[PDB]
Design a protein around this ligand. Sequence first.
Ligand SMILES: [Ca+2]
Ligand SMILES: [Ca+2]
Ligand SMILES: [Ca+2]
Ligand SMILES: [Ca+2]
Ligand SMILES: [Mn+2]
Ligand SMILES: [Mn+2]
Ligand SMILES: [Mn+2]
Ligand SMILES: [Mn+2]
Lengths: 234, 234, 234, 234
Amino acid sequence: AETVSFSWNKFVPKQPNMILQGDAIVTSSGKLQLNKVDENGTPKPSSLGRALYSTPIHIWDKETGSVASFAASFNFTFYAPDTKRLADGLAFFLAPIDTKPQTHAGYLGLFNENESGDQVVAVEFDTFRNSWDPPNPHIGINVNSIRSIKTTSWDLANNKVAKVLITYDASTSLLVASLVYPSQRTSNILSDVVDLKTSLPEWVRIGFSAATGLDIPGESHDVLSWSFASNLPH
Amino acid sequence: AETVSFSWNKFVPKQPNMILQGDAIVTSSGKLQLNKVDENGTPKPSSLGRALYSTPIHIWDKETGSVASFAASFNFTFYAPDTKRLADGLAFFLAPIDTKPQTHAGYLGLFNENESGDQVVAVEFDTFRNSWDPPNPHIGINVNSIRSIKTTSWDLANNKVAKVLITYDASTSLLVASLVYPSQRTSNILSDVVDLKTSLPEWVRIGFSAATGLDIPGESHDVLSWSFASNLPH
Amino acid sequence: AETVSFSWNKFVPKQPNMILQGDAIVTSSGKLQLNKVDENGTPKPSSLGRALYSTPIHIWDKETGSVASFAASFNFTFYAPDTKRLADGLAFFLAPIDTKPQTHAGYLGLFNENESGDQVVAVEFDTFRNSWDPPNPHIGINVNSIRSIKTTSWDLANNKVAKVLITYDASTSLLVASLVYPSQRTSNILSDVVDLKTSLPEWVRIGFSAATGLDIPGESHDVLSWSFASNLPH
Amino acid sequence: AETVSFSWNKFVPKQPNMILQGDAIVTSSGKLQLNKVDENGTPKPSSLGRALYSTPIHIWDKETGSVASFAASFNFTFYAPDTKRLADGLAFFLAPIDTKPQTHAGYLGLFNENESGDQVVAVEFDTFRNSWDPPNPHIGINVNSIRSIKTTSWDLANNKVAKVLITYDASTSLLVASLVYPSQRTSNILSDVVDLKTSLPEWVRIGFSAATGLDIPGESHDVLSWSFASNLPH
Ligand SMILES: [Ca+2]
Ligand SMILES: [Ca+2]
Ligand SMILES: [Ca+2]
Ligand SMILES: [Ca+2]
Ligand SMILES: [Mn+2]
Ligand SMILES: [Mn+2]
Ligand SMILES: [Mn+2]
Ligand SMILES: [Mn+2]
């Protein structure tokens, strides 16, 4: 086997094991703040921040044919000055080692209009209905496209902390995404199969991406903690 | 801290670390078969089997005031000769060290008519609507009563294997129960708060209980694997 | 695979997951005190206490032929009113589920004069030279006999805490025993091969045994903490 | 807490999570070969290869004052065409993020003549007696100096695989280094206290360094596997 793991209950500014892109920064308060915010703490429209764990992960082996199973968890929140006008969302994803930020707003920094997507697999938390979207805030599974292969309703709550759990079982190629609000005693879950061998390169970096509304502030997105474990078998 | 854990991908007949009650047995095939079955593999009505992990778990400390966080997973299935007439269900639970089987059928071997329940906490997978029940097969959280404190719809499927995950976070006293059918790419999740300090004794045994229909065969219930981890803090 | 593990930084009187034999007790102070002691804290000669983890461990599989790898750690100490007259020692061991205390003093509660030993594997910390012994306090590897298959010098220290680590690698059948005194910055290590398949039953209980001098007080032995992990492969 | 871990039973050429310096390469055979070798497999004198795990480790916190505990293991070997003329050795170490190779031969690529050492902590396996050295191959604990704070005899064996275990317990600041030859059923152990807070920077990279004899071939050094875990407390 080949394994890797990590856990933090907080971020540390300038931590050398995280790559930051876009507007993403880490506050003295230990928060990974993905989007730029006004004085009064008001998200600025057209913000785009990404953050990637520095060490590349070995996700599958062309030689042995093995695919890793993995699991990630995190806590996050968003703040919306106007609960009625949200945009655009947050995503957890896997991409090529040299991944750079893509289009903002509704493309969540991952993808691009008029272009087939890099090899990017993501789990989205989407607040804004684009043409390709279902109605309402949803959770989705994106496989090389911002046009989700499967979705589900996300009972979101402004300013409350959401506890997220993502899991991938190589044995069934089944990806599971669950989200829970302890404050609310509320919960959501989504699942589908994903072939990692056909959607990602052998080695990838994993991380976060979030965007504020194109022309509106939408909501800011902050990640509070992060945990992650991968097991690639012999 | 104080921890304990275990994992098996199969059961072994006569394994000395499992307590069996009722009709529960372990097949040569490595299945923990909770209910008695006809020649043709047809569940017998009024069957009741329970099985408990032999070592008692330390769930909370009256001295320090600490409460354990824990997590359990398992795979299970049921077989119903007649999909239209199911009964009664299966449960995962925690009870006092000296726990014995209670009433069958709709009481899931856990509880009793006309009696306040021992200190029993359970997560149920309920196939039969009793008076106290909501309509349809559901998943529930029972806290000393068969009358669930909270429920959710269970998209079940005859003969398919369900992958279950139960979690308890002392920090928020939030219990989470999730169930997934990889065959179906289908999933369900439930959550609520439970005060272990007021609902269980310091030490408990954890295990399985299932019942077939009172006067009908309902469905049989088999557990295939079991994993479990507890962490009681200083 | 099949795994089990546990960890405690202290013992709790009456803990239901420990079996006590002989004079062994657990103090309110969280110490597993193996031998009986005078008012003034003076060991009584001919004391014999054993303690076993309640759940039986699956050490090897006659069917699959697999053997578990495992690891145990603990902290312990002894007190000797007279450093010049020590006896007899302490042992960590594995034995049959129904193991009962054997001969005391130099037999460490494990074995018997004039009898071939049950299926008992042990790692000893031996303070008293019996006929079969090398000179000086030593650490040994006993395989069904109190006459160690291999030994090494133990730089012991009265009243100081020793940190012990025992490991078993099925892949090489190599058992490793290491002991460290942080106070002293001193350390000792021993290793040899042991065939578990030929020296123990499939299932065993693991635990501690200690004896005070036959006609002298020797030293008392206390275990402070215990950790343990086993992995039996498919 | 803050943790990180990893395990590999083999290296993969071009793996993106390892930094290679000097002559270090990874063979198709999955071996991390630290030193350059003739056609016939004969070490070339004045070889110097280092290899570092790419992600920086958080070893202590100036803010909280906490220091990590950690553990590393590995398998390694050396080949000596002439068992009577060995040089110079291998080391496991921790250094600053931007660590570069230093002096070769007896300086093990870590240090320099006439210079006080960077903040480098190491555990050495030393085959050649330099002026500062004790007689015979030894294991040592180097703290900012190639002049070991403590040493012990190393019962080495040409061409056999050694299994190494290094541990650091913040609670006692005690570093433990153990080495075992299963082929030989032979073992060695060393321990001393090390103040990480005064000998390393908060963040470091960990890795391997080995050197062949100045003017002689000495022995080659190959690392076969690597495991590592760190836990930095709140
Ligand atoms: Ca959208
Ligand atoms: Ca019911
Ligand atoms: Ca003796
Ligand atoms: Ca030297
Ligand atoms: Mn969407
Ligand atoms: Mn119900
Ligand atoms: Mn002896
Ligand atoms: Mn040296």
